[PDB]
């Protein structure tokens, strides 16, 4: 079938900003292109169609450019409604088939994160496993890297992470990162860290415990 | 105005059969085709085929022909998806959507408000809860954080308040992660003055509906262990 490539894959853009998102297609639809809104949780919204047509209702901000292979989603004064991600999907052939999105995300300044450690709690060892987690609070950009040492050795293949939306009030993201060992491994190490990297703090930080000291 | 509604979400285990269902108002049913979409989580939206009721005749992309059955009963103006045995990889949410043929294409201009569909061979189970709280001489700052870690509940969701919903600014509740045993975890942290860290209680309440449970979770930090 007919592959079609959004990018950027993601932006972060002011309210007022004008903006630019491109659709390239594998081979020729002529102008059989529409353009969708999706916020999370919700249904997409129909914006565009056959390149360049508003569909009613939509706010005239919203405008489509293009033909054969590559078109172009501009979005003139973007307003605080209009933070979500935007899908095009081409209808030239079946089977029909979409972009793989493009987030509108919110622009502000760089946010060093705080950085917090905790140990795991006496309930949790009780029952064999220890979590350790490592919470990097209202930072910005969202590109981060955290890293555990334990023993001062990099950690891999044993913990997970997860990321909020931007905050409501500040824009901003907050992160949270959990190294999961069995009790037997937690007792037997001394050291534990979480080392963070971030465009906001001028070399890494790091939030360690030591096991018998916390 | 048109409208499509979509059935309830559903928790399903591998090898089970699924109808889900998109029933229609607002407009002349049988004068429309009806397509179904796919969307994992946390990825794009994969088109799935349709049906026009009319005549009953479907399409289907390649990767889901054989895959599922789509269907429409005009009478009462529902189209279906459907499973004969579901995997954990169709874990999903689906949407139906409405087909209007504009500018020489067709487009999708209205769409049902989605059906999650889970599929594990995790068996319902509510959370155990255990406390956040920093070493006891490691706040330095004038801020401390707090949190609860919610661990092995199964399904989603979980709902999280902190202090009987009293306190609200400064939280952040995270989104769960699927761990390996099939079980979700999550955190919710609450950033909160150092100084209060003495005088004031923090207790998380979490609540799952698919288990029924509730637990709530002072949180501390004992001084030995
Ligand atoms: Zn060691
Ligand atoms: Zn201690
Ligand atoms: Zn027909």
């Known amino acids: 079938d007919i592959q079609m490539t959004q990018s950027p894959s993601s932006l972060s853009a002011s309210v007022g900003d004008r903006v630019t998102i491109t659709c390239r297609a594998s081979?020729?639809?002529?102008?059989?292109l529409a353009w969708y809104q999706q916020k999370p949780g919700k249904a997409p919204k129909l914006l565009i169609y056959?390149?360049?047509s508003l569909q009613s209702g939509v706010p005239s901000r919203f405008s489509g450019s293009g033909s054969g292979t590559d078109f172009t989603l501009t979005i003139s004064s973007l307003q605080p409604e209009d933070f979500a991600t935007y899908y095009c999907?081409?209808?030239?052939?079946?089977?029909?088939?979409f972009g793989q999105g493009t987030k509108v995300e919110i622009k502000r300044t760089v946010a060093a994160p705080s950085v917090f450690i905790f140990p795991p709690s006496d309930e949790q060892l009780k029952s064999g496993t220890a979590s350790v987690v490592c919470l990097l609070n209202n930072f910005y950009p969202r590109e981060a890297k955290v890293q555990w040492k334990v023993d001062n050795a990099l950690q891999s293949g044993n913990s997970q992470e997860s990321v909020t939306e931007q905050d409501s009030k500040d824009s901003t993201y907050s992160l949270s990162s959990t190294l999961t060992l069995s009790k037997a491994d937690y007792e037997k190490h001394k050291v534990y860290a979480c080392e963070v990297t971030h465009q906001g703090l001028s070399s890494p930080v790091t939030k360690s415990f030591n096991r018998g000291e916390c | 105005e048109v409208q499509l509604v979509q059935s309830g979400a559903e928790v399903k285990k591998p090898g089970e059969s699924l109808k889900i269902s998109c029933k229609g108002s607002?407009?002349?049913?049988?004068?429309?085709?009806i397509s179904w979409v796919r969307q994992m989580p946390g990825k794009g939206l994969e088109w799935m085929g349709f049906?026009?009721?009319?005549?009953?005749?479907?399409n289907y992309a390649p990767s889901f022909q054989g895959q599922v059955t789509i269907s429409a009963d005009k009478s009462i103006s529902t189209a279906y998806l459907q499973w004969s045995s579901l995997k954990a990889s169709d874990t999903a949410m689906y949407y139906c959507?409405?087909?209007?043929?504009?500018?020489?294409?067709?487009?999708?201009?209205?769409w049902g408000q989605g059906t999650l569909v889970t599929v594990s061979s995790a068996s319902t189970k509510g959370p155990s809860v255990f406390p956040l709280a920093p070493c006891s001489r490691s706040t330095s700052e004038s801020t401390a954080a707090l949190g609860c870690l919610v661990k092995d509940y199964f399904p989603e969701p979980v709902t999280v308040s902190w202090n009987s919903g009293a306190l609200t600014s400064g939280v952040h509740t995270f989104p769960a992660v699927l761990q390996s045993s099939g079980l979700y975890s999550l955190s919710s942290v609450v950033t909160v003055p150092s100084s209060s860290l003495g005088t004031k209680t923090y207790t998380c309440n979490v609540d799952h509906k698919p288990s029924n449970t509730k637990v709530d979770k002072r949180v501390h930090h004992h001084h030995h262990h």
């Open positions: 959507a409405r087909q209007l043929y504009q500018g020489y294409m067709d487009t999708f201009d209205s």
């Open positions: 607002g407009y002349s049913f049988t004068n429309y085709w």
């Open positions: 049906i026009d009721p009319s005549d009953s005749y479907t």
């Open positions: 081979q020729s639809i002529g102008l059989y």
């Open positions: 056959a390149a360049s």
């Open positions: 999907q081409q209808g030239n052939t079946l089977s029909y088939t």
